[PDB]
Protein backbone atom coordinates (compact mmCIF):
# COMPACT_ATOMS: atom_id res chain seq x y z
CA UNK A 1 0.00 0.00 0.00
CA UNK A 2 1.91 3.00 -1.33
CA UNK A 3 0.18 5.62 0.78
CA UNK A 4 0.54 3.85 4.14
CA UNK A 5 4.09 5.15 4.69
CA UNK A 6 4.29 8.00 2.13
CA UNK A 7 5.50 11.06 4.09
CA UNK A 8 3.38 13.74 2.34
CA UNK A 9 0.24 11.68 2.91
CA UNK A 10 1.15 11.14 6.58
CA UNK A 11 1.80 14.85 7.13
CA UNK A 12 -1.40 15.83 5.34
CA UNK A 13 -3.63 13.46 7.30
CA UNK A 14 -2.06 14.23 10.69
CA UNK A 15 -2.36 17.94 9.97
CA UNK A 16 -5.98 17.73 8.82
CA UNK A 17 -7.11 15.58 11.74
CA UNK A 18 -5.36 17.61 14.46
CA UNK A 19 -6.27 21.04 13.05
CA UNK A 20 -9.90 20.07 12.40
CA UNK A 21 -10.36 19.24 16.09
CA UNK A 22 -9.31 22.70 17.20
CA UNK A 23 -10.99 24.53 14.32
CA UNK A 24 -14.32 23.31 15.75
CA UNK A 25 -13.44 25.07 19.02
CA UNK A 26 -12.44 28.21 17.15
CA UNK A 27 -15.79 28.39 15.32
CA UNK A 28 -17.70 27.85 18.59
CA UNK A 29 -15.85 30.97 19.83
CA UNK A 30 -16.85 32.99 16.74
CA UNK A 31 -13.67 32.61 14.64
CA UNK A 32 -13.33 31.32 11.13
CA UNK A 33 -10.37 29.07 10.42
CA UNK A 34 -8.58 31.79 8.46
CA UNK A 35 -9.22 34.41 11.15
CA UNK A 36 -7.81 32.08 13.81
CA UNK A 37 -4.75 31.24 11.69
CA UNK A 38 -3.96 34.93 11.13
CA UNK A 39 -4.45 36.00 14.74
CA UNK A 40 -2.57 33.02 16.14
CA UNK A 41 0.28 33.62 13.67
CA UNK A 42 0.58 37.33 14.55
CA UNK A 43 0.24 36.94 18.34
CA UNK A 44 3.47 37.93 20.02
CA UNK A 45 5.12 38.79 16.69
CA UNK A 46 6.81 41.87 15.33
CA UNK A 47 5.22 43.08 12.07
CA UNK A 48 5.76 40.59 9.25
CA UNK A 49 5.26 40.86 5.51
CA UNK A 50 2.05 39.74 3.80
CA UNK A 51 4.09 37.06 2.06
CA UNK A 52 5.45 35.76 5.36
CA UNK A 53 1.92 35.72 6.80
CA UNK A 54 0.62 33.77 3.79
CA UNK A 55 3.33 31.15 4.28
CA UNK A 56 2.84 30.63 8.04
CA UNK A 57 -0.98 30.53 7.67
CA UNK A 58 -0.75 28.20 4.59
CA UNK A 59 -3.16 30.59 2.83
CA UNK A 60 -2.76 31.99 -0.68
CA UNK A 61 -1.61 35.59 -0.66
CA UNK A 62 -4.61 37.09 -2.55
CA UNK A 63 -6.88 35.32 -0.05
CA UNK A 64 -4.82 36.73 2.85
CA UNK A 65 -5.08 40.25 1.41
CA UNK A 66 -8.90 40.07 1.23
CA UNK A 67 -8.97 38.59 4.75
CA UNK A 68 -6.83 41.43 6.09
CA UNK A 69 -9.14 43.96 4.41
CA UNK A 70 -12.02 42.85 6.63
CA UNK A 71 -9.94 42.11 9.74
CA UNK A 72 -8.39 45.60 9.51
CA UNK A 73 -11.90 47.06 9.14
CA UNK A 74 -12.76 45.29 12.41
CA UNK A 75 -9.66 46.71 14.09
CA UNK A 76 -8.09 43.28 14.73
CA UNK A 77 -4.93 43.82 12.63
CA UNK A 78 -3.09 46.73 11.04
CA UNK A 79 -1.12 46.95 7.80
CA UNK A 80 1.98 49.19 7.81
CA UNK A 81 4.50 50.27 5.16
CA UNK A 82 7.90 48.65 5.08
CA UNK A 83 9.87 51.77 5.96
CA UNK A 84 12.80 50.75 3.75
CA UNK A 85 11.87 48.73 0.67
CA UNK A 86 8.24 49.79 0.32
CA UNK A 87 7.03 47.29 -2.23
CA UNK A 88 6.48 45.34 1.00
CA UNK A 89 3.45 45.72 3.26
CA UNK A 90 3.83 44.59 6.87
CA UNK A 91 1.03 43.42 9.15
CA UNK A 92 0.60 43.11 12.91
CA UNK A 93 -2.08 42.14 15.41
CA UNK A 94 -3.66 44.96 17.41
CA UNK A 95 -4.40 44.96 21.12
CA UNK A 96 -8.07 44.44 20.27
CA UNK A 97 -7.20 41.40 18.19
CA UNK A 98 -4.92 39.96 20.87
CA UNK A 99 -7.56 40.34 23.57
CA UNK A 100 -10.10 38.74 21.22
CA UNK A 101 -7.98 35.59 20.71
CA UNK A 102 -6.29 35.32 24.13
CA UNK A 103 -8.71 32.77 25.61
CA UNK A 104 -8.79 30.70 22.42
CA UNK A 105 -4.98 30.60 22.51
CA UNK A 106 -5.07 29.05 25.98
CA UNK A 107 -7.59 26.47 24.76
CA UNK A 108 -5.26 25.81 21.82
CA UNK A 109 -2.33 25.17 24.21
CA UNK A 110 -4.48 22.75 26.23
CA UNK A 111 -5.58 20.90 23.10
CA UNK A 112 -1.97 20.61 21.94
CA UNK A 113 -0.90 19.30 25.34
CA UNK A 114 -3.58 16.60 25.11
CA UNK A 115 -2.54 15.62 21.56
CA UNK A 116 1.11 15.28 22.60
CA UNK A 117 0.68 13.72 26.05
CA UNK A 118 0.55 10.05 24.88
CA UNK A 119 3.87 10.51 23.10
CA UNK A 120 5.84 11.85 26.05
CA UNK A 121 8.09 14.88 26.19
CA UNK A 122 10.99 13.28 24.30
CA UNK A 123 8.99 12.16 21.27
CA UNK A 124 6.96 15.37 21.30
CA UNK A 125 10.05 17.57 21.21
CA UNK A 126 11.65 15.40 18.53
CA UNK A 127 8.55 15.79 16.36
CA UNK A 128 8.45 19.58 16.75
CA UNK A 129 12.18 19.87 16.09
CA UNK A 130 11.96 17.76 12.92
CA UNK A 131 8.97 19.73 11.64
CA UNK A 132 10.70 23.05 12.32
CA UNK A 133 13.85 21.89 10.53
CA UNK A 134 11.81 20.69 7.55
CA UNK A 135 9.96 24.00 7.29
CA UNK A 136 13.17 26.02 7.41
CA UNK A 137 14.70 23.84 4.67
CA UNK A 138 11.75 24.10 2.27
CA UNK A 139 10.43 27.65 2.75
CA UNK A 140 11.00 29.87 -0.30
CA UNK B 1 5.82 33.95 19.33
CA UNK B 2 2.87 31.60 19.82
CA UNK B 3 2.97 30.01 16.39
CA UNK B 4 6.70 29.20 16.34
CA UNK B 5 6.24 25.95 18.29
CA UNK B 6 2.46 25.35 17.96
CA UNK B 7 2.09 21.76 16.68
CA UNK B 8 -0.89 22.30 14.30
CA UNK B 9 0.92 25.21 12.66
CA UNK B 10 4.11 23.16 12.31
CA UNK B 11 2.25 20.21 10.77
CA UNK B 12 0.32 22.48 8.41
CA UNK B 13 3.38 24.33 7.12
CA UNK B 14 5.53 21.20 6.74
CA UNK B 15 2.69 19.47 4.93
CA UNK B 16 2.01 22.40 2.60
CA UNK B 17 5.65 22.96 1.72
CA UNK B 18 6.51 19.29 1.10
CA UNK B 19 3.31 18.46 -0.82
CA UNK B 20 3.48 21.60 -2.96
CA UNK B 21 6.92 20.56 -4.25
CA UNK B 22 5.63 17.25 -5.54
CA UNK B 23 2.28 18.60 -6.73
CA UNK B 24 4.25 20.67 -9.27
CA UNK B 25 5.72 17.43 -10.64
CA UNK B 26 2.28 15.83 -10.73
CA UNK B 27 0.82 18.69 -12.80
CA UNK B 28 3.77 18.57 -15.22
CA UNK B 29 2.78 14.91 -15.76
CA UNK B 30 -0.87 15.83 -16.44
CA UNK B 31 -2.37 15.15 -12.98
CA UNK B 32 -4.36 17.47 -10.80
CA UNK B 33 -3.60 17.38 -7.08
CA UNK B 34 -6.86 15.59 -6.32
CA UNK B 35 -6.34 13.04 -9.11
CA UNK B 36 -2.85 12.28 -7.80
CA UNK B 37 -4.08 11.95 -4.20
CA UNK B 38 -6.81 9.50 -5.21
CA UNK B 39 -4.62 7.36 -7.44
CA UNK B 40 -1.72 7.32 -4.99
CA UNK B 41 -4.11 6.42 -2.14
CA UNK B 42 -5.71 3.54 -4.07
CA UNK B 43 -2.48 2.10 -5.52
CA UNK B 44 -1.85 -1.33 -4.08
CA UNK B 45 -5.05 -1.21 -2.00
CA UNK B 46 -8.06 -3.46 -1.71
CA UNK B 47 -11.33 -1.60 -2.38
CA UNK B 48 -12.03 0.99 0.31
CA UNK B 49 -15.13 3.00 1.14
CA UNK B 50 -15.70 6.51 -0.21
CA UNK B 51 -15.48 7.76 3.37
CA UNK B 52 -12.11 6.08 3.88
CA UNK B 53 -10.87 7.55 0.60
CA UNK B 54 -12.00 11.04 1.64
CA UNK B 55 -10.07 10.73 4.90
CA UNK B 56 -6.78 9.48 3.41
CA UNK B 57 -6.91 12.07 0.58
CA UNK B 58 -7.91 14.89 3.04
CA UNK B 59 -10.70 15.79 0.60
CA UNK B 60 -14.34 16.44 1.48
CA UNK B 61 -16.57 13.52 0.59
CA UNK B 62 -18.90 15.39 -1.82
CA UNK B 63 -15.79 16.62 -3.64
CA UNK B 64 -14.42 13.05 -3.78
CA UNK B 65 -17.71 11.78 -5.21
CA UNK B 66 -17.65 14.33 -8.06
CA UNK B 67 -13.97 13.52 -8.66
CA UNK B 68 -14.71 9.81 -8.88
CA UNK B 69 -17.53 10.51 -11.35
CA UNK B 70 -15.03 11.86 -13.87
CA UNK B 71 -12.17 9.48 -12.99
CA UNK B 72 -14.54 6.51 -13.42
CA UNK B 73 -15.65 7.96 -16.78
CA UNK B 74 -11.96 7.95 -17.76
CA UNK B 75 -11.58 4.33 -16.64
CA UNK B 76 -9.01 5.15 -13.93
CA UNK B 77 -11.08 3.92 -10.95
CA UNK B 78 -14.17 1.79 -10.37
CA UNK B 79 -16.91 2.06 -7.75
CA UNK B 80 -18.37 -1.22 -6.42
CA UNK B 81 -21.18 -2.11 -4.02
CA UNK B 82 -20.33 -3.18 -0.50
CA UNK B 83 -21.60 -6.74 -0.82
CA UNK B 84 -22.79 -6.81 2.80
CA UNK B 85 -23.96 -3.47 4.19
CA UNK B 86 -24.79 -1.71 0.93
CA UNK B 87 -25.23 1.83 2.15
CA UNK B 88 -21.46 1.75 1.51
CA UNK B 89 -19.85 2.25 -1.89
CA UNK B 90 -16.31 0.92 -2.34
CA UNK B 91 -13.73 2.22 -4.79
CA UNK B 92 -10.56 0.81 -6.34
CA UNK B 93 -7.93 1.81 -8.88
CA UNK B 94 -8.05 0.06 -12.25
CA UNK B 95 -5.11 -1.33 -14.17
CA UNK B 96 -5.37 1.67 -16.50
CA UNK B 97 -5.15 4.03 -13.55
CA UNK B 98 -2.22 2.17 -12.01
CA UNK B 99 -0.25 2.22 -15.26
CA UNK B 100 -1.06 5.93 -15.61
CA UNK B 101 0.43 6.80 -12.19
CA UNK B 102 3.25 4.23 -11.96
CA UNK B 103 6.05 6.54 -13.14
CA UNK B 104 4.81 9.44 -11.01
CA UNK B 105 4.84 7.11 -8.00
CA UNK B 106 8.53 6.39 -8.55
CA UNK B 107 9.22 10.12 -8.81
CA UNK B 108 7.26 10.55 -5.58
CA UNK B 109 9.45 7.95 -3.83
CA UNK B 110 12.59 9.75 -5.05
CA UNK B 111 11.29 13.12 -3.85
CA UNK B 112 10.46 11.64 -0.44
CA UNK B 113 13.92 10.10 -0.18
CA UNK B 114 15.47 13.51 -0.87
CA UNK B 115 13.25 15.23 1.73
CA UNK B 116 14.19 12.68 4.39
CA UNK B 117 17.88 12.18 3.58
CA UNK B 118 19.22 15.08 5.72
CA UNK B 119 17.45 13.64 8.76
CA UNK B 120 18.89 10.15 8.57
CA UNK B 121 17.09 6.84 8.79
CA UNK B 122 16.50 6.97 12.55
CA UNK B 123 14.86 10.39 12.64
CA UNK B 124 12.96 9.67 9.42
CA UNK B 125 11.46 6.47 10.80
CA UNK B 126 10.63 8.15 14.12
CA UNK B 127 8.76 10.89 12.27
CA UNK B 128 6.74 8.45 10.16
CA UNK B 129 5.95 6.31 13.19
CA UNK B 130 4.75 9.30 15.22
CA UNK B 131 2.61 10.58 12.35
CA UNK B 132 1.06 7.14 11.82
CA UNK B 133 0.28 6.80 15.53
CA UNK B 134 -1.28 10.28 15.60
CA UNK B 135 -3.47 9.52 12.59
CA UNK B 136 -4.70 6.25 14.06
CA UNK B 137 -5.55 8.01 17.35
CA UNK B 138 -7.53 10.85 15.77
CA UNK B 139 -9.30 9.26 12.79
CA UNK B 140 -13.09 9.07 13.24
Q: CB distance A112–B7 less than 8 Å?
A: yes
Closest CA to B40 of A58, A15, A5: A5
Torsion angle, alpha carbons of A10, A15, A16, A21, to 10: 130
- Tell me the binding residues of B for (indol-3-yl)acetate: 19, 23, 37
Please check whether residue B72 is in contact with residue B97, taking contact to mean a CB–CB distance below 8 angstroms: no
Question: Measured between alpha carbons, how far is A18 from B101 in angstroms, rounded to an integer?
Answer: 29
Cα A18 to Cα A3, A41, A62, B126: the distances in Å are 19, 17, 26, 19
Chain A partners within 8 Å of B34 (Cβ): none
Closest CA to B44 of A110, A9, A109, A102: A9
Q: Strands, E, within chain A: which ranges?
A: 48-49, 77-81, 89-93
Does B31 reach chain A within 8 Å, measured CB to CB?
A: no
Closest CA to A37 of A17, A22, A47, A48: A22
Q: Is A120 left (phi over 0), alpha (psi -120 to 50) or beta?
A: left
Question: Measured between alpha carbons, how far is A94 from B132 in angstroms, rounded to an integer?
Answer: 39
The resolution in angstroms reads 1.5
Interface of B with A in 45-84 (CB under 8 A): 45, 55-56, 58
Amino acid sequence: RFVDDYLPALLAQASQLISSEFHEVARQHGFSVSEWRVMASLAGSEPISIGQLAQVTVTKQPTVTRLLDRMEARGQVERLPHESDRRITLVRITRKGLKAVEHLMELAREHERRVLEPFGLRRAEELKQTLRQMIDLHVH
